[PDB]
Amino acid sequence: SHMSKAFDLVVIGAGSGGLEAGWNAATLYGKRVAVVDVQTSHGPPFYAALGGTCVNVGCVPKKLMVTGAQYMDHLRESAGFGWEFDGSSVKANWKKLIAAKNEAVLDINKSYEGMFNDTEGLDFFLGWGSLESKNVVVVRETADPKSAVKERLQADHILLATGSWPQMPAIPGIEHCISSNEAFYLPEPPRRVLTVGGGFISVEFAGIFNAYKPPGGKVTLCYRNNLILRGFDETIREEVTKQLTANGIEIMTNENPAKVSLNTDGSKHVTFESGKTLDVDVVMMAIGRIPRTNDLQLGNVGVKLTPKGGVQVDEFSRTNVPNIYAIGDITDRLMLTPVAINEGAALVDTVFGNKPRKTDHTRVASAVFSIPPIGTCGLIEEVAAKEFEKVAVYMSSFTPLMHNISGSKYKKFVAKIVTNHSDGTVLGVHLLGDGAPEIIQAVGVCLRLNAKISDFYNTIGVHPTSAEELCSMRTPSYYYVKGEKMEKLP
Amino acid sequence: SKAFDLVVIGAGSGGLEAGWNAATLYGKRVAVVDVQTSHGPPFYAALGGTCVNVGCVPKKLMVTGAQYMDHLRESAGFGWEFDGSSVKANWKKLIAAKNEAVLDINKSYEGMFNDTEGLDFFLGWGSLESKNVVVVRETADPKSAVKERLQADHILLATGSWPQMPAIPGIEHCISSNEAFYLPEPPRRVLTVGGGFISVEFAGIFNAYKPPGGKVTLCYRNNLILRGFDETIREEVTKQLTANGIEIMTNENPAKVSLNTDGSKHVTFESGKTLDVDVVMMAIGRIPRTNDLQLGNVGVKLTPKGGVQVDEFSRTNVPNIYAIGDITDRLMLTPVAINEGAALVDTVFGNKPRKTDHTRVASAVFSIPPIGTCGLIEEVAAKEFEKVAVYMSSFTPLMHNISGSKYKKFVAKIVTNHSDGTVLGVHLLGDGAPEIIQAVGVCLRLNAKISDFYNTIGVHPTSAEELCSMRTPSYYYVKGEKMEKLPD
Ligand SMILES: Cc1cc2nc3c(=O)[nH]c(=O)nc-3n(C[C@H](O)[C@H](O)[C@H](O)COP(=O)(O)OP(=O)(O)OC[C@H]3O[C@@H](n4cnc5c(N)ncnc54)[C@H](O)[C@@H]3O)c2cc1C
Ligand SMILES: Cc1cc2nc3c(=O)[nH]c(=O)nc-3n(C[C@H](O)[C@H](O)[C@H](O)COP(=O)(O)OP(=O)(O)OC[C@H]3O[C@@H](n4cnc5c(N)ncnc54)[C@H](O)[C@@H]3O)c2cc1C
Ligand SMILES: O=C([N][C][C]C1=[C][C]=C(F)[C]=[C]1)C1=[C][C]=C([C][N]C(=O)N2[C][C]N([C][C][C]C3=[C][C]=[C][C]=[C]3)([C]C3=[C][C]=C(Cl)C(Cl)=[C]3)[C][C]2)O1
Ligand SMILES: O=C([N][C][C]C1=[C][C]=C(F)[C]=[C]1)C1=[C][C]=C([C][N]C(=O)N2[C][C]N([C][C][C]C3=[C][C]=[C][C]=[C]3)([C]C3=[C][C]=C(Cl)C(Cl)=[C]3)[C][C]2)O1
C-alpha cells in the first residue's frame, strides 16, 4: 500500500488527448496505464478535471450555453412564421442554464469515474503530475513541488497532455478581471460585460452574455487589431462583425485595456490605451491560451520547450527525451479536441501497435459557435495565394428565404471554395450561417480525398438546403495570380 | 406561328434548366410553355415548377414555421421563461408569408425571361401536333382555342407529376398537397394518407399549427412508413412522430369518405375502423403528367408505370423528342431534374454527350426531426454484395436531455462493402441531417472507404463528427442474411 506503482505508460492530463491515448493503450494493446488529473469533477478550484478543458470548461458547456443563447433569436424570429405569445413576459434565467450545464458536465465526469474503476490496466490517480526522472512521475497534493507526495508512478513511456490555461495580460487591476473559467460559474448574468479578444472564445461568450443579459444590459467586445477572428476568411470575419453588431453587441476594434479599477459602487472602470473608458459589471479576458508547462518540473529531465513556451515535438509527438511525448494544447499548435484525440491515437498506434502514423495537421475542419456559426476546412484564399501561382475563389452569399420572413435580413449565409486553379484541387472551404459546422464535417473527408471543384459541382444538391450552394459553383467569382486579386484571367 | 430550336413544355426545375442552358450557353432559340405565371389555384404549379410553387420551397418554409413549436417548449430547459398559455400559432400569417416568398420567385422568373436573349415564355397548354410542332391552347381540352403554333427542331417534355388520387367513393371530398398550401384555416383534425415524405412532412406541419384540442392522424396501408429509407430511421421517426402527438395508423387504408352535416369528413377504412376529420390529405404517390401532351399524335412510348420511356440520355423513341424530370418516373427530386435538363442540352447542342447518374443522390425528408440519406439501404446492398457491414451510432443529444425532448434520438448509419471497406450508403436522422449529408454525396463520388471517414479529424462538438468516430461494425449481411458476427 506504501509501494510505488509500475506502468507501461503514465499520462499527465486526463483530458481529450490523454484519455484517448490512455484508453487506446489499455484496451487496444493491453498496456498498463496510469492517468493523473488534479480534480475528479468540473469547477472551482482547478476548473479543468477528469475529461479535460473541453468537457469541464470548454467545447461542451460553451455549446450547451450557445444553444441556450440561440432561443433569443428563435423566440424573436418565430413571430414572422405566425407564432404569438406575450413578448413582455419573456425572461432569460441564467441560474437554470448554469445548473443544467452543471448536471450535464457532472454526468460526463461520473461516466469517466466509472471507466477507471471498471477497465483493467487503466488507472486514475488524483493530484499534480511532475517529472522526477526519465521513468518516474510523482503525484503531489498541489502544483507546488514542495507539497506532499501522494504517489510515485514508474513509467517506461510518459505522455505530457496537461493542455492550456487562459493568458492574463500584466495590466494594473488585472485581479478585477476573469477568464472563460470563471464565466462558466457566474452566479448571475452580467448587465454590462467587456469580452477582450477577437478570438472564438471572446465572440462565443459575447453571444452567450448578449442573450442572457438582464434588462438594459450591454455586451462590449474589444480587440487590439482592426478586424476580429484572425485566421478565418476575411469575408466571414467582416460579416460576423456586422451580425454581432446587428444583434446589439458593441465591437470596439483597435482598442485594448490599459487598466481596471473599481468604482465606488463595486462596478469596473476600464481605461483603454486610447484614453476611452467603459463601466462594466464583468471584464472577461480571452486574449489567448498558453501551454501548461510550469508544474511539470520539465527541468528535471531536460524536455525542450519552443521559443513560445510549448513542448517541442516532432511529427510523431516525441520530445528530445525518447520515451517522453507531448500532445494537444501543450504543443501550442492547433488547440482543438479532435486534434488532441487524433495525436494521442496516432502516438499509441506508433509506440504500442506496429502501425506508425503521424497526425495530419492540414485540412482540419473546425467551427465557431458565433450566432450564426462558422464552419471552415483548409486554406483561406490569401494563404493559398502565397503557395499556388493561380488560386480560384468560388463565392455564394444570399439572405436565406427563411430570414426574409423571420425579419433577420442581416443573417447573410456565405459559402466559399478556394481552389488550386491549375488542377481544380479544393484547398479550402468556408461557411457562415445555420448548419455551417454540420455541413463542414463531410467536407473534411472530401479534402482528405483530394476533392477537385468538379467533384463538388458534379454531385447532385439536396434541395432545399444551404449545403447545396457547395455543389452549385461552376465559375470562379475571382482569382489570385502570382498573389494578386483580379475578377478575370489575362 | 414562330420558329425555335428548342420548345420546352413545362417551365419547372428541369425545363427552365434546359431552357436557360440552351439560350445562354449555346445561343439557341428557345420557347418554354407553362399554364400559369404565378402560384396557386387553379393549376397550383406555374413558372418555377412544382418545387417553387407547391413543393420543396413553400413546404420547407412551413416546416421552418412548425419547428417553432419545439423551439418554444425546449427553451424552458435553458431557462427561457414566458406565459406558455399566451402561445398561439397563426396559420394565416404563415401562408401569407409563404405566398409572398413564392410570388417574389415567380416575378424573378418573369424578370429572367424579359432580360434573357433567345428565351421566350408562352402561357397555355402545350401538346404535340406532329414531330416538329408544339400547339399551345387555352385549356387542357385538346379542342380549345389554339393560341400559338411553335415549329421546333427539338421538343422537351418536362410537365412533371401530379398527385395520385385512388378510385374510392367520396375521393372528391379529399385534398392533395396542392390544396394544403392554400387552406384558409389550420385543420383541427386531419388525416394525411401515405407513408412517403409528403405525408410525413405535412403531418409535422399541421401538428404544430393545429388549433387548441386538435389531432393529426397519418395512415399507411403497409406496416412501416417511408419504404426505401433505412429501416432503423423508419422505426425511429415513427417513435418520434408519436412522441410529438401524431397518431400513426399502420395497415389502415381509406375505403371511402363522405360529407358530415358540419362539413367534416367521415373516413371508413378497409378494416371498418372510422375517423371524423376536418381534412383528408391524400399523399399516396405522384404520377407523370402525360395526358394533355397528346403523345399519341406522334407515338411517344410510355412505361407500364405511366412515365415517358427514355434511354440514359433522356431521348424518347421519336428522334427529336426528349423527356426529363418527374414525367420519366425515375427520381422525383428537383436537382435530379435540373441535372437531366443540363445533361440533355449539352448532349444535343454541345457535342459532349453527358448522362445523369441516378446512384448516390443525397435526399432529405423534412420531418421533425429530419432525415438525410445518400446511397444504399443495407437490405438493397445485401442483394448486390457478398459481405455488407453496418456501423451504427444512436444517442439522445445532450441538448435534448436539457430541453426535455429526451425522445429525439439522433441516428447515423454507414453501410459498407466489407470486402474492400467502400462506403455504399449513409443515413442520418436528427437536427442538421439534411445539411450533414450534402458533402457525403461528394464523398461517395470519391470512392470514400469507411477508414477515410474514421481517419478524418472530427469537428467538435457536432452530430456530424459521429460519421468520423465509427470503426467497428455493429452487424453484417453475409450472402443476403443479417448476422451480428462474421461466420472467423
Ligand atoms: C472556452 C473554450 C471553448 C473551447 N471550445 C472548443 C470547441 O468547441 N471545439 C474544440 O475542438 N476545441 C475547443 N476548445 C479547445 C479544447 O478545449 C482543447 O483543444 C482541448 O481540450 C485540449 O485537450 P488536451 O488533451 O490538450 O488537454 P485538456 O483537454 O486541456 O486536458 C488537460 C488536463 O490536464 C490537467 N492537468 C494540468 N496540469 C496537470 C498536472 N500537472 N497534473 C495533472 N493534471 C494536470 C487539467 O486539469 C486538464 O484536465 C475550447 C477551449 C476553451 C477554453
Ligand atoms: C409537396 C411536394 C414537396 C416536394 N419537396 C421536394 C423537396 O423538398 N426536394 C426535392 O428535391 N423535391 C421535392 N419535390 C419534388 C419536386 O417538386 C419535383 O421533383 C420537381 O419539381 C420536378 O421538376 P420537373 O421539371 O420534373 O417538373 P415541375 O417542376 O413540376 O415542372 C412542370 C411544369 O409543367 C407545367 N405543365 C404541366 N402540364 C403542362 C402543359 N400541358 N403545358 C404546359 N405546361 C405544363 C406545370 O405547371 C409545371 O409548372 C416535392 C414535390 C411535392 C409535390
Ligand atoms: O434560403 C436559401 N437557402 C437555404 C435553403 C432553402 C431554400 C429555399 C427555402 F424555401 C428554404 C430553404 C436561399 C435563398 C437564396 C438562395 C440561393 N441563391 C440563389 O438564388 N442563387 C442564384 C444563382 N442560382 C444558380 C443556379 C443555376 C440556374 C440558372 C438559371 C435558372 C435556374 C438555375 C439560381 C439562379 C441563377 C440565375 C438566375 Cl437568372 C436565376 Cl432566376 C436563378 C443558384 C444560387 O438560397
Ligand atoms: O449532443 C451530442 N452530440 C452533438 C454535439 C454536442 C456534444 C456535446 C454538447 F454538450 C452539445 C453538443 C451527444 C451526446 C452523446 C453523443 C455521442 N456519444 C459520445 O459518447 N460521443 C463522445 C465522444 N465523441 C468523440 C470522441 C469521444 C471519446 C473519445 C475517447 C474516449 C471515449 C470517447 C464526441 C464527444 C461527445 C461528448 C463528449 Cl462529453 C465528449 Cl468528451 C466527446 C463522439 C460522441 O453526442
Residue numbers in the entry:
A (entry chain B): -1 to 488
B (entry chain A): 2 to 488, 493
What text does the study give?
Trypanothione reductase (TR) is a suitable target for drug discovery approaches against leishmaniasis, although the identification of potent inhibitors is still challenging. TR structure from different protozoan parasites has been extensively characterized by crystallography, showing that all key residues are conserved. This homodimeric flavoenzyme possesses four cavities binding two nicotinamide adenine dinucleotide phosphate hydrogen (NADPH) and two trypanothione molecules. Each NADPH cavity is separated from the trypanothione active site by a flavin adenine dinucleotide (FAD) cofactor allowing the transfer of two electrons by the participation of two catalytic cysteines (C52 and C57) which, together with H461′, E466′, and E467′ of the γ-Glu site, form the catalytic machinery. The active site features a hydrophobic cleft, named mepacrine binding site (MBS) after the crystal structure with the mepacrine inhibitor was solved.
To validate the predicted binding mode for further rational structure-based drug design and ligand optimization, the structures of TbTR with the most promising compounds 9, 10, and 14 were determined by X-ray crystallography. Additionally, with an eye to ligand efficiency, the p-fluorophenyl group in B of 5, 8, and 10 was removed while keeping in A the diClBn or the phenylpropane, leading to 12, 13, and 14, respectively. Quaternization of the piperazine promotes improvement in IC50 values compared to that of 5 (IC50 = 54.6 μM) by about 3-fold for 9 (IC50 = 20.5 μM), 42-fold for 10 (IC50 = 1.31 μM), and 23-fold for 14 (IC50 = 2.35 μM). However, this improvement does not seem to relate to the interaction between the positively charged ammonium and the protein but as shown in the solved structures, rather to the larger inhibitor structures, more efficiently occupying the binding pocket. The densities observed inside the trypanothione pocket for both TR dimers provided well-defined results for some portions of the compounds, namely, the ethyl-p-fluorophenyl and furan moieties, indicating that these common portions anchor 9, 10, and 14 to the Z-site by van der Waals and electrostatic interactions, as previously observed for fragment. From the interaction network, it is clear that the furan and the ethyl-p-fluorophenyl groups anchor 9, 10, and 14 to the Z-site, consistently with the binding of the initial fragments. It is also evident that the dichlorobenzyl group—when present—protrudes toward the MBS together with the phenylpropyl moiety, making a T-shaped π-stacking interaction with W21. Despite the presence of the bulkier side chains of M406 and Y106 in hGR (replacing the smaller L399 and A102 in TbTR), it seems that the binding of 10 and 14 toward hGR is not fully hampered. No clear correlation between the enzymatic and cellular activity could be delineated for the series, though the lowest EC50 value was obtained for 14 (EC50 = 8.98 μM), which is at the same time the second-best TR inhibitor (KiTR = 0.8 μM).
